[model samples]
Target: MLDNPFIGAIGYVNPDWATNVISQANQTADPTLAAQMRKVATYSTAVWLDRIAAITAGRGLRGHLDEALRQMQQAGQPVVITLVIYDLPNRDCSAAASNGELLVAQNGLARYKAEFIDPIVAILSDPRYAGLRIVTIIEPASLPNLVTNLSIPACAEAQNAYIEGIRYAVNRLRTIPNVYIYLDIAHSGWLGWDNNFNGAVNLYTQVVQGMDQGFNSIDGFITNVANYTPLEEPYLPDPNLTIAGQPVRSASFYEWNPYFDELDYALALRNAFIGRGFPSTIGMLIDTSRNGWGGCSYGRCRPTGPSSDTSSVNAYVDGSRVDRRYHRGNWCNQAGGIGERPQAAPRSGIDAYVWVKPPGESDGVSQPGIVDPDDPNKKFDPMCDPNGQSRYNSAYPTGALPNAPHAGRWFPQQFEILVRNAYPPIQP
Candidate 1:
């Protein structure tokens, strides 16, 4: 629904907050650090259009939605709003920090449709808000788990519910003439494995076809929502084989990233959709918020340092820069600067590359205190250790950013880390 110059929505910028932090830190006499903080204090981040009341501490969606639509109507160009429908029950099956209170077994689906989904739809369906383009990034971390971790029981149990919920959302929302929707496909790290690829595709296809309108009911698929990975990796190709037994061609394959970048995954998934009769108009979207590390080793973004030029952007993983460490599921308060600024002009095979996940929001709590009482079986993922203790901590076992707060809350330390190491390097 967006045009080519790659317009973006101005996330709520807090110049006041930035100035306040800068002044307070200045009392310490570290002007250099203060200046960096100044830059971070001013950088614009996307506004979080959340669904659940808990995310906004009980304010609910009306005020936020009204403000978002108001801003969109007044923006100079069409602004791409990154709205997340994340309140499904038992959400985020493996983690605790961002898990929702909804329980599918406990009528979560019924409540979700009646309470959550319908209310949001009613707001979006309003003709007054019809003037602006709205990009709704439906459920992140939803479908990917079903495909990769079905053996975990919970994933399998929630499969049908998720399918039904997503289908209902799509069918209902497609009625909005200006709203563009994209479903999340896990980043190449989890779905990129040979064992998980086909199953992910199958699940994706099932969801696509599950609705009454079939694939036509949806716009496209979104890859790597809120995760960190380069947009594209030319250095790597699909390491797996095709059913014909020959090597899978890597070019244009969104799943063939040398390290499973979203570019490869989108192309591969698009191909799968087309093979199954999905219309070519269906597109793809990538969340490039915190993935601008170029290449990582352990938890650090660019092993050698931030890439200085276009050639150097992805050169680290190509062996030209030897210090790059392959990313192996090191998500959670990841270090590295804001990788790519929000752009909606459109690139690759996708409709637009968006900043769906707001940068600076913690992925989850590094410390473990809050637990989901409903599903006590869900263990706290140690990757979120407050000390940054991680199994992959050969270099950054503690984590790229320490003392990270709960998911969705602001993390000032992480903000500075990302700004300092940003791919393009923010200006002072």
Candidate 2:
């Protein structure tokens, strides 16, 4: 049984984010908002390496690793740096927002291994940085897309590359003694359905089986990366609750998904994976960055208590649920609040509750056809538009905030919302 690397280790706060937040803080006119923005800088969030250039561009992977060493030296404590190993070929296959620079038809898989994963491996494997614990959140939303989104042509086409690229990454990265690889399992909203859940288990097991170390190659799995799924639904506790002859699970909010929130999803996934032969010691991670909103954690919420409204199933759910989103599938730059602060071993089977998705970074552009001037590959996804129809819930709008910048770019407006609505409100 491999040990949880995050245990007793201090998480590394990316200096780049801190610097950016400081600048945002200094520039903001409101004193309270600026103070709150500064508070956000104190917590550690995962640094995303979404493109090849990000490996060493400004304060890139090495820069962050070097800073981690410095922080450890200054604090005189063990520090762990979390890196998102994104950039799979035809990445974000099911979405247009955060596509990669590589494509399967353009020899993307080969470059993904050689240019992307290999360089990251070389950097993490360096002896000078061996003391720092490196946690790699491998390929957000990659495998889960394969399970639930085969109908999308890009997803279907990129299937083999995603599989091979992930296997290669896991096989290579795990060899580094201090490196811990946590494969992304998406979130309960995406994969909690029985068929999708079973498919993910089978697909992930098959992928791990192909790795050189099989199950041993990974530390565990991560859920809700860059998403807004609650850590737990405090009010809507029972999926089976009957209201007006309707199951609460049947409500559009849950859409018959069994797992209510990320905590349930993480524990269930860990059990499912272990049942499929993964090591019992393997842990799970939940990206709690934006899930803190709408759980009645603070008094500023509706659904003040459990619902007595039995007029309809939707009424029952709408009256009692904690997640504020109209649909679980409504992920983009949606109106969400900052979740729990990052912590290690927050629950059994959970290695950590992490902010893998840095708050303030836009999930995607609100308008269609707009592209990042710096990276043309970063195209506008309609999913980020408040007016656009939601792919997840056909009957509803995308639930995204309007006028957001391209994915990964800093959005001050969204950051302010997050700070104001943070569940455990940022302390003074």
Candidate 3:
């Protein structure tokens, strides 16, 4: 019998997706935000990993992370489950098109390097965490944005802080051996440069240099963690290679959704890794949860509400891709365009493609049931930001609630849709 299996699970808390989510207390002096983040188990993990499981609360009792891992051990899900941890507290989205980013340069690193990254590293590396190997999803938006957009004048500190942070974690953390650390290259469809293979090479190289502490880091690179895209590319009908060896003529796009493009990423990252020479790492995975539907029917990704990320990244709430641009909808006055660049494969030299953020779980609030779905008015984690740092309107998902709907919980259609999307066996 296979030992400690995992069924290619999917969900989030990946990269900056859940960075530095330090929760606040509520009226009853309870950790309102932390409480919410804890609910992650009830709503999603239970359904995705095991219907019989419940969250142990990472800190409380044993929490769901442990429970989920244990249940997978019993059921034998899939050993090569993709995992992505985030480095947020460092994300300084507060930049008002100017000093905000600079301020991030000044303070972001210090905040994340100390609290967010280190603490988690210790936990993952501990011997107690033995028999449980996972994929370490390095910070997502936090660094990618800075690496791509931030100018010299902005983060004059340059990518040093960013690179150093990765290097520190990769080299310093004993758990580095236990995890397959994949640096996120954001969803292809979002980056304007992702289409240009050369640009990707430059970015991945920079990340490698940084991760290895000016040397080389672990296995390979990863792509399209959280963004929504199809899982495949079209296949040319092989005339003589068919089972019957007949001249085939079907030109297939081999994709989950017309717009959802994933195969493209696999090819790219594979090339990068091979060219870069990280052989032990075979392939990578992408966040395939919500993406199963392959982009919302309404349009694209839209915000759940006005307060979300006003940066123009569409927040999909209530089934409609609010921003109609690439993201499927708009927010406030912004076009709410798709946050990713549409492309395939890592430039010329990367290795793998991974789903940094596990899907099916909320980006906090996009899907209902966990938080009050119908109430456009209700926000999950809304607290004071004296420093005004978060890009999200609410911090409760991580800082406050972490686990929103409570473990063993489910939204109205979460399971039904999930079931329809299953490519394998999973009981309803």
Candidate 4:
């Protein structure tokens, strides 16, 4: 049984993020909002290495590790740093937002290994950082897309690269004793359907089985990276309920997906993985960054209580659900808030409830033709626009917040919304 790396260790609150939050707080005229912003800085959030430049750039991989060591000394205890290894060749094939710096046709896989993964591995392998428990969330939305999105040309073309690249990453990273790698399995929204669920389990099993250590290469799986999927839907617990002669699961929001929330999905996925030969002790991590408030209009418009409406499936679902997105698939900057604070062993199967996706960061641009001035490759994804049709549900608009900047850039207004709508309600 593999031990939970997060056990007995304090999380490393990324100073970079904290610093930005502090800056936002200092500049704010509202004292209460400023205090809340300051409170946000205290929690630990994962640092994303989305591009090669992130390896050495301001408070990059090495910088973050060095800071982690300093934090350990200051605290006089073990500290765990969460790093997201996200830049795979042809990454995020299903979406234009957060599109990667590498491409399969341009020798992207080779460069990924050499330029991206290798440098990261080198930094983690450094003896100076051996005391730090390094938790790495490996390649979000990579493998899962292969299972469900092969119909997309970009996904079809990059299939081999995704498999081989992930295998290489796991195999190489497993060599480091302090490193605990968790492969991203997307969210319940994407893979909770019966077919997608089974397909994902099989696909993930194949990838792990091919690795040098098989299932042992990875510590566990992470769900809902940079996406808003509630930890649980309290009001609507059963998917089998009948509302006005229609099954509740058949509601447009649910669409017959048995898994209602990330907690359910993560636990079920762990069982499936164990049944498929993964170690029974393998745990799960849920990104709770933006899943805290799942109601309409950034959680401000949430139903005061459970709905009594039994008129129709849509009415029941719309009124009962905590998640207020038009569809489960709208993943860009939508109405959301800061979720559970980062903590270890938050539940039985969950190793931790982490802020993997930092709350203040924009998921993507909110316009159609916006270009990232820093990286031309970081193009706008229409899914981030409130006016644009959702790629997942064409019948509805993307439901994203307007005036949002390019992905990863800090949006102060979004941060305010997150603070205002924090699930536990950020205390005085």
lDDT of each: 0.62, 0.86, 0.37, 0.87
Model 4 segments more than 4 A misplaced: 294-300
Please give the lDDT score for candidate 1.
0.62
Q: Candidate order by TM-score, highest to lowest?
A: 4, 2, 1, 3
Residues 203-233, model 2: lDDT tens digits: 9999999999887889899999999888878
List, residue by residue over 167-249, the lDDT tens digit for candidate 4. Answer: 99989999899999899999999999999999999899998899998878888999999888889888778888888998888
What global local distance difference test value does model 4 have?
A: 0.87
What's the CA RMSD of model 4 in angstroms? Answer: 1.6
Instruction: Show the colliding residue pairs in model 4.
Output: none
Clashing pairs in 2: 292-339
* lDDT at 388, model 2: 78
TM-score comparison, 2 vs 3, better candidate:
2
lDDT, residue 2, candidate 3: 16
Query: By TM-score, how accurate is candidate 1?
Result: 0.78
Q: Return the number of clashes found in candidate 4.
A: 0
Please tell me which model should have the higher TM-score, number 1 or number 4.
4
lDDT for each residue of candidate 1 in 1-428, tens digit (9 for 90 to 100): 54321344554332333444466456434557566556655443434444445234333444545655556556654444456777666678655556666777898888888878887888787787665556677778888888767777766778877888888888888888777777888787778766677788788887878787787777788887877777754433333423234333332222243435677777878887788888877777778777776434343334343233333223322332211323345677776556666555456567666666766667766656665343343334677674544554344453445676667666767765665667756556
For residue 240, model 1's alpha carbon misses the true position, in angstroms, by 9.7
TM-score of each: 0.78, 0.96, 0.52, 0.97
- Candidate 2 positional error at 94, Å: 0.8
**Cα deviation in Å at residue 33, candidate 3?**
30
